[PDB]
Amino acid sequence: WHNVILSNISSNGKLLAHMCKDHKSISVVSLFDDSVNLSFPLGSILSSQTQSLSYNTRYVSSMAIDNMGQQLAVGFASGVISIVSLADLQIRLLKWHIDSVLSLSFSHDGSYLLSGGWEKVMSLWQLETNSQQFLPRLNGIIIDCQVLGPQGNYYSLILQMTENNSNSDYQFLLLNASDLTSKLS
Amino acid sequence: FWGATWISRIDFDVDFPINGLTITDESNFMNHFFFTDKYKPLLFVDLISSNELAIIERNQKAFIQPKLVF
Amino acid sequence: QVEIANILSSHLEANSTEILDDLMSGSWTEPEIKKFILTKINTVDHLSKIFLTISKSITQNPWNEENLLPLWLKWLLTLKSGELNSIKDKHTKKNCKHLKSALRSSEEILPVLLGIQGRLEMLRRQAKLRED
Amino acid sequence: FITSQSTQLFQLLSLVLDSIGLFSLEGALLENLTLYIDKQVEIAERNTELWNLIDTLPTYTMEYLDI
Amino acid sequence: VKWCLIIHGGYLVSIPNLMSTLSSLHSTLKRRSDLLPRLLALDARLDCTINKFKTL
Amino acid sequence: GSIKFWDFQFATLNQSFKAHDADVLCLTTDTDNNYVFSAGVDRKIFQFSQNTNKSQKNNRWVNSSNRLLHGNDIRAICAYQSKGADFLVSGGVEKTLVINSLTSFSNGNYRKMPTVEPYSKNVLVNKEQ
Amino acid sequence: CTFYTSLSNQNQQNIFTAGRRRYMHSWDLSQTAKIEKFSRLYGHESTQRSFEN
Amino acid sequence: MRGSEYQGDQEHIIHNDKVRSQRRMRAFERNINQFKWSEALDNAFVPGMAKELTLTVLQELRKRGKVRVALYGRDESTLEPLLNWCLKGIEDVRSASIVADWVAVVLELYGNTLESSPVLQELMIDLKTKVRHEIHKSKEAQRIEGMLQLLT
RNA sequence: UGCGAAAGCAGUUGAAGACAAGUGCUUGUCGUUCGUUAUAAAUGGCCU
Numbered sequence: 086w087h088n089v090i091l092s093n094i095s096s097n098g099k100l101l102a103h104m105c106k107d108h109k110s111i112s113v114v115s116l117f118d119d120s121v122n123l124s125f126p127l128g129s130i131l132s133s134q135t136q137s138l139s140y141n142t143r144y145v146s147s148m149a150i151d152n153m154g155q156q157l158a159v160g161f162a163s164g165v166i167s168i169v170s171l172a173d174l175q176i177r178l179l180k181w182h183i184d185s186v187l188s189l190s191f192s193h194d195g196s197y198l199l200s201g202g203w204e205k206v207m208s209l210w211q212l213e214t215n216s217q218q219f220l221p222r223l224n225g226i227i228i229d230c231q232v233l234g235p236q237g238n239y240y241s242l243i244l245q246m247t248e249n250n251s252n253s254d255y256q257f258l259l260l261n262a263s264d265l266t267s268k269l270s
Numbered sequence: 271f272w273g274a275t276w277i278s279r280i281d282f283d284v285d286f287p288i289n290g291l292t293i294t295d296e297s298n299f300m301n302h303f304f305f306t307d308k309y310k311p312l313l314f315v316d317l318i319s320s321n322e323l324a325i326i327e328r329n330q331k332a333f334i335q336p337k338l339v340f
Numbered sequence: 341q342v343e344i345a346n347i348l349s350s351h352l353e354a355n356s357t358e359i360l361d362d363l364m365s366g367s368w369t370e371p372e373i374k375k376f377i378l379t380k381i382n383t384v385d386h387l388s389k390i391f392l393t394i395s396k397s398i399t400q401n402p403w404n405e406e407n408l409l410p411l412w413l414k415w416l417l418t419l420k421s422g423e424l425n426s427i428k429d430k431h432t433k434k435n436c437k438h439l440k441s442a443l444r445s446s447e448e449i450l451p452v453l454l455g456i457q458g459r460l461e462m463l464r465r466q467a468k469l470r471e472d
Numbered sequence: 473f474i475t476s477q478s479t480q481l482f483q484l485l486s487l488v489l490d491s492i493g494l495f496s497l498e499g500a501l502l503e504n505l506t507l508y509i510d511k512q513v514e515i516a517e518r519n520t521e522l523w524n525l526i527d528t529l530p531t532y533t534m535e536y537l538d539i
Numbered sequence: 540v541k542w543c544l545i546i547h548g549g550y551l552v553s554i555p556n557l558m559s560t561l562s563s564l565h566s567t568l569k570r571r572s573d574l575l576p577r578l579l580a581l582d583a584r585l586d587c588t589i590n591k592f593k594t595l
Numbered sequence: 596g597s598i599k600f601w602d603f604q605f606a607t608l609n610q611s612f613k614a615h616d617a618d619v620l621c622l623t624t625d626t627d628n629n630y631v632f633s634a635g636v637d638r639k640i641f642q643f644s645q646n647t648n649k650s651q652k653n654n655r656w657v658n659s660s661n662r663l664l665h666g667n668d669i670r671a672i673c674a675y676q677s678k679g680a681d682f683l684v685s686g687g688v689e690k691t692l693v694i695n696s697l698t699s700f701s702n703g704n705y706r707k708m709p710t711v712e713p714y715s716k717n718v719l720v721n722k723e724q
Numbered sequence: 725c726t727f728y729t730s731l732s733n734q735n736q737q738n739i740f741t742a743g744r745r746r747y748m749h750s751w752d753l754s755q756t757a758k759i760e761k762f763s764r765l766y767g768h769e770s771t772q773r774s775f776e777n
Numbered sequence: 778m779r780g781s782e783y784q785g786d787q788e789h790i791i792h793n794d795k796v797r798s799q800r801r802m803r804a805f806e807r808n809i810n811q812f813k814w815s816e817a818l819d820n821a822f823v824p825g826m827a828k829e830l831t832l833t834v835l836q837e838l839r840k841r842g843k844v845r846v847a848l849y850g851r852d853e854s855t856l857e858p859l860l861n862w863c864l865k866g867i868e869d870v871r872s873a874s875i876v877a878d879w880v881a882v883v884l885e886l887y888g889n890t891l892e893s894s895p896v897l898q899e900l901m902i903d904l905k906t907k908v909r910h911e912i913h914k915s916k917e918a919q920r921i922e923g924m925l926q927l928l929t
Numbered sequence: 930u931g932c933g934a935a936a937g938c939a940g941u942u943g944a945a946g947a948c949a950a951g952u953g954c955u956u957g958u959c960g961u962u963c964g965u966u967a968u969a970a971a972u973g974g975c976c977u
Contacts, residue, residue, distance in 0.1 A: 090960055132702045134971060140958070142971060155649065165971055170647050176701065178660050180973050183338065206975050209766065214612055215658040216767035221975035263750070263760040274709040291694050291706045294679035304539050311709055314718035323537065324720050328711060330688060332667040333617060333636050335972055339846050374594060402519055405511070410518055417525045418590050440526050446519035449479050451575065451919060453513045456486050458920025459927050460506055465545050467499045490927055494548060524583035544924050551928045564925060570870045571918035577877045578911050585905045588884050592892040663972050757790050763977045812974045
């Protein structure tokens with residue numbers, strides 16, 4: 086693939102979703118098999134109101150691909166999340182983040198979405214009813230999120246502590262999904 | 271001529287230079303120049319005198335949905 | 341006072357150097373300074389000139405005893421602020437900076453002056469007491 | 473000379489007025505120094521204000537249509 | 540306070556220590572003096588708007 | 596403020612969505628029942644979609660999107676589709692109509708009709724006097 | 725109260741308990757006891773007032 | 778129900794996880810926590826509100842960087858409670874500086890509304906008198922410090 | 930951006946390429962380059 090702007094790998098490690106400038110297009114490929122091979126321009130996903138507005142709205146900052154490949158989550162610097170159904174390219178809008186979303190990760194089943202950004206709050210979106218739960222007052226903004234376990238027992242998070250502009254201060258956090266308490270910082 | 275939000279005047283002695291949200295209308299319905307949109311909405315428009323034009327314009331609690339401002 | 345107002349208006353149109361002389365004329369008083377600004381300063385160009393002349397004068401000698409030139413600046417800023425900052429001339433901003441520098445000094449000055457004046461009041465009162 | 477950057481010259485005067493003491497100071501001069509300072513205080517207040525200055529539908533309306 | 544300093548100035552001078560025993564004056568006076576630059580700034584701002592609508 | 600989908604034969608709840616912040620005063624559906632539109636006091640119009648094939652097989656509705664178009668309550672809503680027409684018309688205390696496209700509700704343009712459109716004039720002027 | 729043994733991983737043992745409270749306890753299975761508290765319903769808190777049954 | 782009294786005096790392991798009950802939070806604190814900026818200002822200016830408690834919500838909003846945001850959606854009707862307090866708080870040394878900031882913003886944000894509203898004008902006339910009164914007091918304290926320096 | 934105190938004292942904010950929009954021309958943009966020390970605005974706010 087040429088001129089890759091953004092790339093992500095599914096949690097299982099068998100699907101790769103990446104974006105290229107060939108404005109830009111999203112393509113998803115299965116790695117160990119030929120079952121999944123899809124491509125489409127970003128214009129199709131994007132809303133027209135997004136087209137009318139400033140570039141922040143058309144700027145994707147985070148990307149996630151479900152294990153089954155049916156769903157794909159696209160973040161935007163405006164703070165909006167769009168879940169797109171690969172089967173029909175239908176769009177779904179989840180809007181809570183006021184600032185750019187930096188981390189998106191699907192659960193193994195695909196029913197729950199971990200989102201994190203400048204808000205210093207990790208949000209579990211429940212996609213069945215579009216509800217959500219929060220873990221706020223984290224030590225720093227969430228660069229990355231992941232669900233780590235055969236059953237999603239643990240959540241692995243990367244924090245930045247943006248207060249210190251002199252250096253990048255990364256903190257790796259392993260939370261027990263049971264009670265959302267820091268198992269290992 | 272005037273509509274809900276527009277007013278127009280056409281002189282009938284002069285020919286003009288040749289140079290989504292409604293039914294597409296594939297089916298049938300059964301079976302010198304001035305234009306201004308400055309004045310709206312208009313209830314009624316008429317001339318009081320030869321050089322006098324009359325424009326008549328229109329001059330509840332609602333559930334709050336705040337607009338974020340930083 | 342009508343004559344000086346028309347005289348000052350003419351010099352503004354004539355780009356004369358006597359605009360300053362018109363301004364420090366003693367005939368001016370507080371209300372007439374207001375009325376001239378509100379009624380006669382209608383062009384942006386004239387507003388720039390009067391501000392430039394005044395600010396250069398105050399910048400050179402901010403401690404002049406004459407309150408007339410500062411009085412002009414006070415009401416000019418109060419009444420025509422919207423038209424003034426509309427000016428985008430670089431020299432005007434530099435001129436505003438130069439004036440700001442001179443005035444900034446004086447603000448720092450007052451705590452010491454009050455301390456001296458208060459000191460001096462005590463010395464005067466004791467002399468009165470010794471007299472009695 | 474005073475009664476006849478300046479702050480370092482003024483603030484030096486305050487040091488004089490301290491060193492002279494209460495007793496040595498004689499009334500006649502003290503009046504003149506008072507009027508001069510009272511003038512200076514007024515000017516300082518006047519300039520200070522200027523510095524802060526620099527930092528800072530009808531039911532029925534008549535118009536003519538353009539045509 | 541003004542008369543106490545004037546009358547007993549000679550005695551007040553000849554005291555081993557004043558800051559410890561007059562600390563309340565210095566504390567109270569320092570607080571009020573510190574406010575002077577800001578209060579003036581508001582006075583200029585208030586005088587501006589007060590003049591503006593009065594003439595208008 | 597809840598929208599609930601019930602199974603008719605057994606009279607049970609299949610899904611519950613806590614969508615609105617206030618009363619849900621009207622509901623309407625498209626021709627094939629691929630979309631259910633709600634509106635109410637909170638001035639929002641929520642689109643619930645079941646267009647995807649996997650959704651149809653599993654019979655699960657989704658809170659697809661929402662839009663704020665009205666200045667006040669939304670009391671009446673209706674939907675019409677034809678080979679040449681696609682309308683989602685709504686109105687309420689604002690006293691004006693709002694028209695959308697059912698198929699392209701999330702991204703399609705909308706029109707706000709005039710409050711008073713004087714086909715029958717309620718005011719006259721006499722040139723004399 | 726009740727024991728629980730994961731059907732796949734037989735080595736897993738756990739004890740769930742509840743009361744007239746808005747939280748549930750789980751005890752993994754000797755200096756200390758590994759006890760975790762379930763107190764989050766993910767938006768359905770209104771429907772559930774007590775974990776007692 | 779006889780087991781409530783027991784405190785595990787005989788049991789092998791005692792596990793204690795209940796979080797201590799924190800004092801209830803006042804109305805203004807709840808609004809700030811929920812990001813209700815405009816309401817937090819209102820809860821400040823209510824009858825029978827402790828002056829210290831009123832000063833914090835003013836400082837707290839300023840610290841948060843939400844001063845203009847708290848003053849957008851307002852008119853003369855809901856602006857007077859602030860001006861009334863500012864008419865009084867300007868006297869106190871502790872709240873003088875905070876009064877300085879807020880009054881500066883409202884003038885910079887409601888100059889136009891000020892002209893058309895008479896009641897707002899009388900507030901600022903009285904406010905101008907009181908600040909002028911403070912200038913005399915603050916100046917006088919400096920004069921005292923001047924003399925007090927001479928003695929030493 | 931440099932220096933300095935916190936006040937301030939000096940000095941900048943250029944050029945090219947490409948895309949979109951409107952009408953070869955006009956404007957706006959850049960997950961494009963070279964050189965110099967060099968407003969925002971997708972109804973979107975923090976758990977138990």
